[PDB]
């Protein structure tokens, strides 16, 4: 769970496609089942890819298991970084929780204090003034 | 009169695994260290994992 | 012959008794157990108070002001009630209740809303700072299908 | 329960390996049953090893029986040391406790006031967030 | 030669009747004795009040402020509720009753726990002084086997 | 009620005797807790049309039991005596659970 | 109360066994929860009188 | 229950063999049944043996019970001492017991 930088985007592909993919890009070696899903469509930009990856399994997509040298995966949105300058990512998680509900869409929390969002652009966009809002009270120290 | 008494089929056998492997199919999947020296962990071609260390084979 | 009406409704009586056994059976809980509730409470205006005029939770029942004694604050299905930290907890007694639920407790604690406070209730939690509670998980916890609608707050509700 | 300090990076190995692996580092000597598992991924950094065992244990492994001179075994995420200068790591355990829910993910607290968390990145970032802003408020004496 | 069917199933239905008639009739009993149990209740409060606010027990219906006529709060199965020092006392009517229950009561009698105060619910109890009563023995006491289990309560319990 | 029905609107039933008739039952009626059948003329044996039998019921308190046996006529609540006429079913004619007296308990 | 009704009073019936009898039922009786039912011995069958369950 | 101050250490053992080093130490003559449990791992330092055995018990292990003579029993960890300077130790009780649970 550590990995270069990335943009993903798929438009309209099969998950066993974005799989290979992503493990010709050295992101392990990756291999499914047979039948895990079918088709799905997202974008991404500026996300390491095993995020974007655990991102993709909430998507439609399965969930994964590492062996060790290979990975076991069985059965636009975007997504945006928000760097959380002023308050700590934890603080946003009850009002965050609060706007998914029964939604999808999901927010990750990574260790460098930055938020990140995959859903549909009016969940993100929700998402982001909620979470600029509440750095902005923050900010002024 | 043989089986109506006590069976055992004892070990001599081959079992010798990656010296019949070659060294650049093999994979470092992890490390181990701590007071009972270090020790690495290595994939088969076939899958298997194994662990070795300094001075093993 | 004939003799299967008074035999099969004597056995239709028995059989009902068998299906309405479990319905009392948590009905019966689910009621000792709202009292466990009503026993902790009336004792948070003693806690309360104590934390608004002192800015700390009272340590135990004496400092709430109330009897002193935790076994004093029993009842029929209550073994009894500690105020631990201004956490109010409540045993089940072991005699004349349920069967899963004696010697079982829940707590009602509260939380600094700067000029008052707000109390929660579920089941049993410890106090860690003035702000801060904790599942008390020992395995002693009256089971969550024993526990009110207003009684199932988490050791982290706000 | 005490060890030198270690890392301990397992990328889809077999527990009887990670766990062959452990005693011949000294740490006993360690034999499973047969058919304890399978496979797990962890990637601990700075952990003594008996802890990184319990932690093990925890993630999908066994629990451990030790007949003193053996010990019998039966049926990324990462570890990391948290200091706690200021604060006692006891105070933290109700706060902790309420973000694992459910939830994997657990806490071990050492006797020298250090928090130690299992977990994948997205929750030990969290329990990170929460410790050092905790501990942040004891440094203002 | 025939017909035993018709004849059979007519005398297992009344012996099933005969059978049945000793179950209704306890529940029945054991129901109109819960009734004189909650006419007695729900003038607690005045009682506790009077209590709490004088620190002497009601002397009458009229001191705790309640139908000042006994008669005044009776019931179906009820007959009367008197206050007399404290100790509530329920009468069974005489028509529209069991059998082995009419013209029989209970009593609701309370304990000074000091600030507040506990109450009992069992068999016919007198008041000796403000913390104590005695059975009323006299043989007019509702038998314990028409009582539910939260009015058991004897004399002396505290 | 704590009081017998004393007819069989009271009871709550076929308010009219000949309305619990049958093929050979003229009727049935409730006379004070008593429930007498009549037997038709029509139909019947020889030596049992136009007789009848009785049930009646005792308190038991809380519950009640009851009797089947040659007709009788409650006296008090829990009292009740032969309805000597002679017009009774002939004991022979009375099932083994139908024999019960005035006094049985 | 948690306790099985020692006996026919405690569960709250007829306090004698022998006032829960009937036609073939010499009696009734509560013994700790357990309710037994003798058969009388006028009246019934032969080989079932005096003969419980 | 009074005896010398020792240190068990205790690494994957018989509880039989930790109870008859324990006489073998004059902290009675010990005697099990014959099948009382199993295996045992305890690490304790600076604890009287008296209690460092009640403590043995609470493990895994077993009941004691004194004819006089000799004792009957029937079917790492550390231990340390706290010293408490300033405040009484049954004070601690009510949120000691609360840590523990049904731990």
């Known amino acids: 769970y550590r990995g270069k930088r990335v943009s993903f985007e798929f438009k309209d592909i099969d998950i066993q496609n974005l799989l290979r993919v992503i493990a010709e890009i050295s992101k392990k070696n990756i291999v499914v089942a047979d039948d895990v899903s079918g088709k799905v469509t997202i974008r991404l930009r500026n996300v390491p890819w095993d995020q974007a990856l655990d991102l993709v399994l909430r998507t439609k997509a399965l969930g994964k298991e590492e062996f060790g040298n290979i990975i076991r995966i069985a059965p636009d949105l975007m997504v945006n970084l928000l760097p959380v300058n002023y308050a700590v990512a934890a603080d946003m998680a009850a009002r965050v929780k609060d706007v998914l509900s029964e939604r999808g869409s999901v927010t990750v929390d990574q260790r460098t204090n930055v938020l990140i969002v995959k859903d549909v652009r009016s969940n993100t966009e929700r998402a982001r003034s909620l979470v600029r809002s509440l750095d902005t009270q923050t900010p002024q120290v | 009169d043989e089986l109506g008494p006590v069976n055992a089929n004892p070990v001599a056998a081959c079992n010798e695994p990656l010296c019949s492997f070659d060294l650049d199919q093999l994979k470092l999947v992890a490390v181990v260290t701590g007071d009972a020296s270090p020790v690495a962990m290595v994939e088969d071609p076939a899958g298997r994992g194994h662990i070795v260390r300094r001075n093993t084979r | ?158």
């Open chain 3, 1 to 158: 012959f004939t003799l299967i009406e008074l035999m099969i409704v004597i056995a239709i009586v028995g059989i009902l008794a068998a299906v309405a056994l479990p319905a009392y059976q948590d009905y019966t809980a689910r009621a000792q157990v709202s009292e466990a509730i009503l026993l902790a409470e009336g004792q948070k205006s003693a806690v309360t108070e104590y934390y608004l005029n002192h800015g700390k939770w009272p340590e135990n029942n004496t400092s709430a002001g109330v009897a002193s004694s935790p076994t004093d604050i029993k009842g029929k299905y209550v073994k009894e009630v500690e105020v631990k930290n201004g956490v109010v907890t409540a045993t089940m007694l072991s005699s004349g209740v349920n069967n899963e639920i004696k010697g079982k407790k829940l707590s009602l604690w509260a939380r600094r809303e700067n000029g008052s406070v707000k109390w929660f209730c579920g089941q049993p939690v410890t106090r860690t700072d003035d702000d801060t509670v904790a599942d008390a998980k020992d395995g002693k916890e009256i089971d969550t299908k024993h526990l009110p609608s207003t009684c199932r707050d988490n050791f982290d509700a706000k």
